[PDB]
Amino acid sequence: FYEESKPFTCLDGTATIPFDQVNDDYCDCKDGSDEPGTAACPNGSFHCTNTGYKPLYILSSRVNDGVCDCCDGTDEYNSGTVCENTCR
Numbered sequence: 001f002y003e004e005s006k007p008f009t010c011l012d013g014t015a016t017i018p019f020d021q022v023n024d025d026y027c028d029c030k031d032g033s034d035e036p037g038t039a040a041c042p043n044g045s046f047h048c049t050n051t052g053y054k055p056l057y058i059l060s061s062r063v064n065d066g067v068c069d070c071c072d073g074t075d076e077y078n079s080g081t082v083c084e085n086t087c088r
């Protein structure tokens with residue numbers, strides 16, 4: 001009748017979790033692949049999309065650290081620091 005969506009598998013094959021454990025602010029994958037958008041994994045990376053300009057990757061520990069790391073300011077989305085777009 002209703003088919004269920006498949007779960008997420010860590011890019012390193014170390015675990016399979018439902019997609020509600022993706023970006024849930026707890027590190028479930030040894031490679032950090034379940035938390036690309038948060039500061040939860042010690043070896044993760046956050047992608048600065050920097051729309052219109054060169055994209056950059058930063059350490060996950062720099063997501064919501066209150067410091068402006070991406071020129072588009074997208075790394076600071078719930079920290080209290082409001083970053084201005086400085087890509088130009």
Ligand SMILES: [Ca+2]
Pocket residue numbers: 021022023024025026027028029034035
């Ligand atoms: Ca997680």
Ligand SMILES: [Ca+2]
Pocket residue numbers: 062063064065066067068069070075076
């Ligand atoms: Ca930051």
